[PDB]
Enzyme design. Structure first.
Site, mmCIF file in Angstrom:
data_model
loop_
_atom_site.group_PDB
_atom_site.id
_atom_site.type_symbol
_atom_site.label_atom_id
_atom_site.label_comp_id
_atom_site.label_asym_id
_atom_site.label_seq_id
_atom_site.Cartn_x
_atom_site.Cartn_y
_atom_site.Cartn_z
ATOM 1 C CG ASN A 38 56.140 13.872 57.359
ATOM 2 O OD1 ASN A 38 56.542 13.752 58.533
ATOM 3 N ND2 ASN A 38 56.633 14.774 56.529
ATOM 4 C CG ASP A 103 51.949 11.405 53.516
ATOM 5 O OD1 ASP A 103 52.079 12.162 52.509
ATOM 6 O OD2 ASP A 103 52.838 11.315 54.385
ATOM 7 C CD1 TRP A 104 55.850 10.620 53.304
ATOM 8 C CD2 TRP A 104 56.711 8.974 52.077
ATOM 9 N NE1 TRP A 104 56.565 11.209 52.281
ATOM 10 C CE2 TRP A 104 57.099 10.199 51.512
ATOM 11 C CE3 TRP A 104 57.136 7.777 51.467
ATOM 12 C CZ2 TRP A 104 57.879 10.261 50.383
ATOM 13 C CZ3 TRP A 104 57.926 7.853 50.314
ATOM 14 C CH2 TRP A 104 58.285 9.090 49.795
ATOM 15 C CD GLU A 127 44.946 14.189 49.733
ATOM 16 O OE1 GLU A 127 46.063 14.703 49.938
ATOM 17 O OE2 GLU A 127 44.221 14.529 48.791
ATOM 18 C CG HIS A 269 47.659 15.327 53.315
ATOM 19 N ND1 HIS A 269 47.815 14.531 52.191
ATOM 20 C CD2 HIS A 269 48.475 14.804 54.259
ATOM 21 C CE1 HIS A 269 48.694 13.574 52.459
ATOM 22 N NE2 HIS A 269 49.106 13.719 53.704
#
Length: 291
Positions: A38, A103-104, A127, A269
């Protein structure tokens, strides 16, 4: 750092909707599957893929509702993403794979790996998503904003009405400045406010202090699998980081079996936007040891 996206579009229809994906490099052999999070897309991997395509097939899908993929009217819970990516993987006929996740995309990759361990040859990550016990662990510069993202009425005004995840979070979590042409590539899928639902549901699915319970359970499950799995792992980290600060990367180098770590230098990130060449070249150097 390159701003173009020189990849021919490929589409596959799964569960009634078209998903876009990059597919370059050799036409066979073990493919390397890149999974974004995201509020990004396959554009996030554009400067890393060219280091890997000389040796291995590279596949990078845009998650449902994002990038150039279609936009069904879903609530876009993590479970919706799981269903679409599971179908995408089977439609392409993939057997064994190497994962490169963030991330996702890392929650999707680790959950797919825990369920299909015999099909994963290696995992490169950065991350990534882990159970967060308390807000104390979230870095100060971003803590109150993420709390607002998960509160009514306020989080939807910020993310859906004002597009804060694209105009605020994304560039503020890259150390070097993203340029307008790069920002326009990221803005393209979300020009219409209603199409921003996934951008708001995702932060509301992060497992923090026990909620939401279903996600906490599934993330705990893949973490246990990861701590006991001999699959080769390559972890990229930056300073100060966001989800994985330096001290935590060093602890994970120890707590995860067969895990090599790579310091990318300054990063928050979206590490791919600060040092894509080191990330791509190190993945390329690591792949032959998986043969």
């Amino acid at each position: 750092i390159g701003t173009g996206f020189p990849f021919d579009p490929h589409y596959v229809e799964v569960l009634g909707e078209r998903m876009h994906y990059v597919d370059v490099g050799p036409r066979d052999g073990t493919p390397v599957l890149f999974l974004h999070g995201n509020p990004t897309s396959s554009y996030l991997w554009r400067n890393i893929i060219p280091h890997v395509a000389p040796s291995h097939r590279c596949i990078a899908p845009d998650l449902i509702g994002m990038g150039k993929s279609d936009k069904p009217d879903l609530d876009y819970f993590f479970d919706d993403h799981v269903r679409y990516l599971d179908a995408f993987i089977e439609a392409l006929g993939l057997e064994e794979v190497v994962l490169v996740i963030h991330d996702w995309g890392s929650a999707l990759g680790f959950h797919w790996a825990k369920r299909n361990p015999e099909r994963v040859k290696g995992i490169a990550c950065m991350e990534f998503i882990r159970p967060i016990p308390t807000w104390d662990e979230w870095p100060e510069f971003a803590r109150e904003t993420f709390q607002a993202f998960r509160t009514a009425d306020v989080g939807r005004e910020l993310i859906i009405d004002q597009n804060a995840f694209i105009e605020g979070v994304l560039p503020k979590c890259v150390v070097r400045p993203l340029t307008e042409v790069e920002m326009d590539h990221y803005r393209e899928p979300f020009l219409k406010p209603v199409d921003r639902e996934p951008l708001w549901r995702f932060p509301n699915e992060i497992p923090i202090a026990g909620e939401p319970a279903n996600i906490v359970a599934l993330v705990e499950a893949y973490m246990n699998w990861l701590h006991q799995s001999p699959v080769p792992k390559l972890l990229f980290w930056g300073t100060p980081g966001v989800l994985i600060p330096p001290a935590e990367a060093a602890r994970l180098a120890e707590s995860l079996p067969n895990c090599k770590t790579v310091d990318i230098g300054p990063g928050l990130h979206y590490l791919q936007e600060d040092n894509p060449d080191l990330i791509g070249s190190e993945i390329a150097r690591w792949l032959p040891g998986l043969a």
